[PDB]
Symmetry: D2
Subunit: 221 residues, 4 copies
């Protein structure tokens, strides 16, 4: 399965997909009691749909992704309500030592009172101390659902995400944009790369006529 | 894959595609404990467990796309199910064909009426023919399609694509595969259940035994 | 507020929760703040609209009572992010209420048949279909079956609860020349009520987010 | 109506549209009718609940203002049929407010170390994490990056707009012993407010549709 590594321990993996560019073509044509025609006229229809705001046909293309990301990234991601999610539980699972530790280059462009290297080390210390406490609590009999409240927001979680192409394009408009947090931007770029490979016509038409973000127009795949 | 079931006099329900199966739900449920699939036996058992206890989100990862031909009055009820995607034939854009649902006398099989049931079928076909001819005359005279079609009756057939996940589909079956729903849509619901059963046997059986609230599927 | 539409239709406002300030407060919570001043607050609404910050507007909710022809309702009910409760032809005996277009509805079209004749032809179908409907029910045919002979111009009634964000989507799509003329009229009524209750949001919407054309011309 | 929850949290009702009669009006439209009388209207609410006619309750809408720990909010925000606007760690400097469980939270569990010490250990990490956070911010580190060291018990604040149907789903799932104790407390507060504003609906809900366990015990 296509799997793209993100951040230091994260990833985005495509699990399954239903439909393709032609699915949208057929769904649009039913309006006129028609179906598919030719690869030329059909690709042209996708462009027409995109530039005129005919979005419902794209709801028939559905993706399911497997994602590993820090909780602070997931919190933002899960705000996209038009989708389905199933996530790893801290109430039910003993948590592993997997945290997002940003490299010094994450602070590139900002003037700091201390070396970027120090910030990275400072974050690492908090992680170590918090996880150590988490383990001490669980080993002592503290219920998992309580012990985990001391763990930081950079803890990695895992989830399945099923979303249709229309909602996915909304996600890209909002997250594959410089105003979004850099960390989720990286995930949106991976999502875009997978989208591009499975629905090339839809993706191209989207970038040329509907995309309202900036990064996908300044970054290849 | 593909399956097609004929409904009423000229309708049908066709499965266009499907993403996921019973194991998709098992996997989605297991992620909670950082696990995946296990064994054929423990997995089917997990499905019954999810159904029994109301853990419904794992079933959202199973998605179906159907192609349906049904009368407008049936489609009006169907389209009230908001958690789904639809694309339908348009009377504003397309010239409409002579295709209407004419109930057989058997539709009234059980009701005592003043005039013969055969008469009812005749009366309906007559009004349908009159309305359709009027529609054609208007169209032929240059009246815009969107206006000319307002004289067409509710039994006119329409066609649409329906993409829906298993969770919403189960809600649809609870409400439509039931004696309280109109008979005509009960027929379509039975076809939908028939296809659901074929593609997700474990989920369907678990649904029927522990969560299904309707009655016709248990008969 | 009630506005008459078409020949027998209407749009009536039943209830409303929130106002322009509801969106301001919802927006300010991001920075752990609330309301400020009448001037700063309106500027914020414009800011939200201009930059596509739409979620704050979901906290403003409206409930309308609408009477419209079924062909109009079919299009309206395609708007899934909303709540609906409608009159039932399965349960209620239907009244003689149909939308009959006036000749003026065909202005701009050259027809082989005089516009007035079109109105008459539609009235004819309505009368014959309704009479058939009544005859069937009086004979013993269940309502849910007898009503299938009634035309798409039959009037229905429904309650519609929708938040401002979904309402703006509705206006973008229906208060537009590409939408069927009949629903455009309802959209204009909906817009008028929206403007009355949330003038800042409505004005900002028209200036920076509205994608339709008619509200710009009317 | 404001109710304190946990050590520093709360649930407050901000606004509400409709009441029990809104559902009655919405339901009766099916038979082209309106309200009747107290006795008949209360009876209809029970009938709807008993037979699963849930859409009429979507016309009752509530807006709450809630302050809860992030781990509670993560569970809460999984309820998609609702609207949310929340405090942002990317844009605002975060305050020193965390949920520190009191020793009683461990009542019933067998631990090797006194419960009071568990409370003490949690406070220690919280203190260290927050200090680290402040140190980074004052050194020029962007807020969105500095906050990643903060634990899941940090309090957040949000506005929640939800209709009665979705609210009842939330109570079925959260006002239940299988839900985390912390969110059960919030659900009990939400339930109290719901009961005060829509007593007929709440009573019918508890009698015919509620699938949880605690609301039948408390
Ligand atoms: C740069 C950035 C900064 C942000 N800052 C904050 C912040 O400070 N605080 C905060 O709380 N959130 C914040 N968010 C989250 C934001 O408010 C949305 O929750 C998030 O973008 C999900 O978007 P959505 O509503 O468009 O998508 P979805 O929830 O997936 O919805 C997709 C579409 O369906 C719609 N829709 C879905 N549900 C409803 C509904 N109930 N009513 C009306 N329309 C609906 C709309 O057309 C929507 O675009 C931020 C997001 C970004 C990208
Ligand atoms: C026998 C029968 C008689 C009926 N009679 C009438 C009638 O007289 N008048 C009439 O108007 N309708 C009538 N209906 C339609 C009914 O009101 C629903 O619109 C229809 O059943 C679709 O169901 P749903 O809301 O459960 O499904 P969906 O719209 O697909 O929703 C699925 C689930 O998501 C939910 N959900 C979706 N949207 C919202 C929302 N906005 N707020 C809260 N929860 C939401 C609920 O948990 C719901 O069960 C009837 C249906 C049946 C089966
Ligand atoms: C001029 C015109 C012509 C039309 N012609 C046709 C036709 O020929 N055939 C036909 O079938 N329909 C047709 N429609 C209906 C159209 O396909 C939509 O169903 C209708 O506009 C409702 O819009 P909506 O999806 O944006 O709104 P809502 O359903 O209210 O949704 C609002 C927002 O939430 C979203 N959203 C809701 N549900 C989902 C979902 N499941 N997946 C992804 N995003 C979602 C999107 O961001 C959306 O804009 C037409 C509409 C117009 C205005
Ligand atoms: C005790 C408990 C343990 C849990 N454990 C986990 C866990 O380990 N991992 C995890 O990921 N989650 C877990 N959850 C969250 C759970 O999976 C749901 O996300 C949460 O209960 C929100 O419920 P909901 O979907 O019913 O509500 P909403 O999202 O508010 O939806 C309300 C109704 O609309 C519906 N609906 C909304 N969207 C859709 C859709 N896309 N398709 C079909 N129907 C839809 C259904 O009828 C639904 O009941 C847990 C919840 C509880 C109460
Ligand atoms: O870029 C952002 C900022 C905020 N939020 C939503 C996510 C959380 O629900 C809440 C606070 O997010 P943070 O700013 O703390 O990440 O608002 C996002 O979705 N994206
Ligand atoms: O069994 C029913 C009855 C009604 N409705 C919804 C469909 C329409 O939006 C409106 C009226 O439907 P009819 O009763 O006329 O079919 O209410 C259904 O979905 N199913
Ligand atoms: O302007 C339009 C045209 C179509 N449709 C949706 C409504 C129906 O579900 C179906 C066919 O509508 P008509 O074209 O027949 O009105 O497509 C709309 O919502 N608006
Ligand atoms: O009782 C629970 C357990 C889990 N989850 C959802 C919330 C998060 O998205 C993810 C993990 O939650 P925790 O178990 O870590 O709280 O699953 C809930 O909504 N409620």
């Amino acid at each position: 399965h296509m799997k793209i590594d993100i951040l230091d321990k994260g990833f985005v993996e495509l699990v399954d997909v239903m439909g393709n560019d032609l699915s949208a073509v057929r769904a649009a044509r039913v309006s006129f009691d028609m179906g598919l025609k030719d690869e030329e006229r059909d690709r042209h229809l996708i462009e027409y749909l995109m530039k005129h705001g005919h979005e419902t046909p794209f709801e028939h293309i559905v993706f399911t992704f497997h994602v590993k990301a820090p909780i602070f990234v997931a919190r933002q991601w899960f705000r996209h309500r038009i989708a389905s999610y199933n996530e790893l539980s801290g109430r039910y699972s003993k948590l592993s030592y997997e945290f997002y530790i940003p490299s010094p280059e994450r602070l590139e462009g900002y003037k700091t009172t201390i070396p970027p290297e120090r910030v990275t080390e400072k974050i690492s210390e908090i992680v170590d101390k918090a996880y150590r406490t988490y383990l001490e609590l669980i080993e002592s009999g503290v219920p998992r659902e309580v012990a985990r409240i001391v763990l930081p927001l950079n803890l990695y979680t895992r989830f399945f995400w099923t979303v249709n192409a229309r909602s996915l394009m909304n996600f890209l408009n909002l997250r594959a944009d410089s105003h979004a947090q850099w960390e989720i931007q990286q995930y949106a770029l991976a999502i875009a790369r997978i989208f591009k490979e499975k629905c090339p016509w839809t993706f191209e038409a989207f970038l040329k006529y509907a995309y309202k973000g900036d990064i996908l127009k300044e970054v290849q795949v």
